Amino acid sequence: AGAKDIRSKIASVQNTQKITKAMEMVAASKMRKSQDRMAASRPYAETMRKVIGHLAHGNLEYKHPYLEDRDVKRVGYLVVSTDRGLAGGLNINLFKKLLAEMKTWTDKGVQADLAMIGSKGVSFFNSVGGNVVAQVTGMGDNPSLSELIGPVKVMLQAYDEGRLDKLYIVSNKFINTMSQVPTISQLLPLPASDDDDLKHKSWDYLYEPDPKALLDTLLRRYVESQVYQGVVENLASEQAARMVAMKAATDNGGSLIKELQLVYNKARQASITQELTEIVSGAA
Amino acid sequence: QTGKTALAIDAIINQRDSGIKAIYVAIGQKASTISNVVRKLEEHGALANTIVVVATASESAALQYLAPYAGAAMGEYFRDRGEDALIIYDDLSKQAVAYRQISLLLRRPPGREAFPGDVFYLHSRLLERAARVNAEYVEAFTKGEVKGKTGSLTALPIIETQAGDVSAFVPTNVISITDGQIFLETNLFNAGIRPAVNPGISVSRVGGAAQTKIMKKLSGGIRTALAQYRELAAFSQFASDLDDATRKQLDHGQKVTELLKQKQYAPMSVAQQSLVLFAAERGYLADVELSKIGSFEAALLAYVDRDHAPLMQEINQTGGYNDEIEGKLKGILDSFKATQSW
Amino acid sequence: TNVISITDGQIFLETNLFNAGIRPAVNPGISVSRVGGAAQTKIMKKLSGGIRTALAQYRELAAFSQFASDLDDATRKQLDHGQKVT
Amino acid sequence: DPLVVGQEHYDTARGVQSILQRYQELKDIIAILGMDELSEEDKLVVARARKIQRFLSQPFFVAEVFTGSPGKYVSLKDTIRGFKGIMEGEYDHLPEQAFYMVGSIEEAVEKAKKL
Amino acid sequence: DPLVVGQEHYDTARGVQSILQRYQELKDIIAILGMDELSEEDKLVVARARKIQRFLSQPFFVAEVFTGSPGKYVSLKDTIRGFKGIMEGEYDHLPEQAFYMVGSIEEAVEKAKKL
Amino acid sequence: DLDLAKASATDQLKKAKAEAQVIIEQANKRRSQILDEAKAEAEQERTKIVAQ
Amino acid sequence: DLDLAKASATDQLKKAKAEAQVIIEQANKRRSQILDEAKAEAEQERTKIVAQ
């Protein structure tokens, strides 16, 4: 009813466009805040990687399950995902890349299972029916490491006891503001390339109580730090993907309003033209 | 092409044994369509109960304009005797178009949308002839030949809207006059909801006083629940979490929507309708997967007709409802859903 | 349309404002006086320019009021000012 | 207006209008974006508005033939007290369907217990 | 009508009509939000409906002076078999372009080999 | 347990065997109902067509 | 022993249920044949009578 409702419909789209125009700026600010948090986490992990390098590849060379090579009979992943919608295809892209590798090990007859961060991943993989052993959800902004100790400890327990022989983290990477990429990278066993030194392990550390407890706890903390950092970097990628999705929603809404207006002006003009034909015809 | 005529000729076909006489008035249709309709009424037992009044598209505008009034005069013969008649006026809007032709050719001043102003008086004097008369009026008309019987004429006019636009002059007049409307619409019909009855904008102004008590008891809950399901389904459409009242509502309403679909020329008796509605109101559908709901209904009608026909006779004859009726229907649903297969 | 063309200015009263509780219901930014500050006393002329610009800033920020928790404080101040003038 | 109705009634009616007005704008966001995009205060208004919308319903004992249910009469005094109670917290915990065609607020709790 | 056409034809036509109707219902969502916001079943309706819209296309013998590519005559047995196969999802591994302007469903799979 | 496992094994066998027969027998009741109905109404149709 | 017995029950029930459906399909095939042949015999009586 162009005289009546097309008029309101335009108002509803105009209001919707004004809102999404604002959400693009919210997302672009949260992306900045997450980007600072992302950078702070890198120096703790990079320091800890230096310590395990010094003890692992030091002149006396130690042995540990999380560090040593093992052949594969079961493979494990843990996966990060959003608790909120919008953000384009970000989750689905990562999930289909995960299914591609999960199918690759399945073709090798290698059993797989998943640990899960975020309720989108919970829902998709229950819909697939892939084995999910652990879950955490509802972090929002400001996620905390304390939550994530749960998920890693049961994956750690699985890996050490043989139930798992490889473990990977599945997450998106914040290349920059404009581009983000879904990636999978290994946690257990420790994949990192060897390194070499003289001063380190020549001016060797006094150990307390002993160098074995300090290798065990240190590895436990390192892989924990690796998945905290992946969680933060995926969160930065969520805000970036939402910022872009709100740009499209704002331009799409602006494209619809103008087509609804050309349609309305036709109805506005036609009804004037009809009713004057009636008034003049009725003045017989 | 939404099933307007199909509904009205099925309402004729079903009167074949109800004792209600039928009239079908065809205004402005093509004559081979009236051949096809009569050929379907004769393929059932319905034509021997029915009068067919025709003014095809070739016939003069005076003949089309009068055709509804001629049909009503035939229905009034039964109404004034103490017998029931059902009259269908197919395309009252074609009667208005013929009346506009007559009025402009007579140079009467055109009013809105070029119809004459009296066009409301055309339809309203037609439709107020459909009435139930008290026994005293029958006795006076029959001069004491018939005593104690109340006669009735029931009218089912049909209007075509151009684009769902109810604001046109002829639709707004006829919507003002009648005791309710059934809206059939294209979006439901294309979705496969046939009959495509929109529960929200359709209403009966007589309501429950027209029903048998069993249908009255079961059906009152259905229509307003189903309307709110459509609001709920809109509000829900992107929300990931449903509270279980909402999640239950978002399922029950889909299963009721699926239950009300029905094939053409396949009318169901009161007991058959009541049994299937009882299965939905008392929750027995809830676990059955939705595409099976169609087969569930077919198997339930088949099961009950072989094994429990004395109750079907009881309900069809009485329309009654009691605790033993609720108990026997509960026992039938409990027994069917255990023993049989969809 | 004729009277809009003839007159010197418009006070638009709106029902949404009247429902929401802005009972004088005057809608700024669509209401106008083509005479303006010539009509107005020196004190009112001096002070009223603040109101005019504050409500302009308020309208654009009102779209962010749903999620105004994560904003620049300058903006948070402006928003909490547009509301209190309103 | 307060010079007839008194301020008690006037404040209650203007309150109900302001809430239903706000909710009509919020309802436009929800239908496309979903309800999670609201502030938790706008979510709360969407809740208490959607209740008030149902609490204004009332079955009439001239409509039992349509409804099948017993009609209700309310005093003005009881009407005011009920709307204040939805505008404040007292019934934040009842479902929406617990209001629909109820009668007094004092029996909306009972339909919630039945629901 | 099932009596004259028989059931397999009638069911195929009503299936095509139901999928294409549901695609109209989704297009206003897709137009603003884009497709990523759809459910994974809603994405499958779209992915089928778009194939169906292409397979409805056909090269006409009188149109060769415009299209150049040679005209096709398609049997009723091949048409109901093709659409029934698409709606059963047998062909959900082919691209949309495979269906455009092909006479029969076999011709779509040969077009798909060369994309 | 060495006895509850025996008891449940016969308990399932008994119930499952009876229901499988009941299902298939009432499939024969449905078949003969369908055949009886068709075999009857074929003449109910013809006796209408000759009266026509 | 208990686990195997419960799985054997579910096989037996499901197999009987499926066999009931093909039993019913064949009764529908008979019904649709019997009624179509009734119509096709009846028309060849009516045309014969009216031609007489």
Ligand SMILES: Nc1ncnc2c1ncn2[C@@H]1O[C@H](COP(=O)(O)OP(=O)(O)OP(=O)(O)O)[C@@H](O)[C@H]1O
């Ligand atoms: N309940 C139903 N189920 C399936 N198909 C139906 C049903 N009712 C009607 N149809 C089909 O809908 C089509 C149109 O029905 P009908 O001719 O009654 O519509 P109409 O609105 O009268 O059309 P017109 O406007 O041309 O008079 C027919 O093909 C008919 O077979």
Ligand SMILES: [Mg+2]
């Ligand atoms: Mg028709």
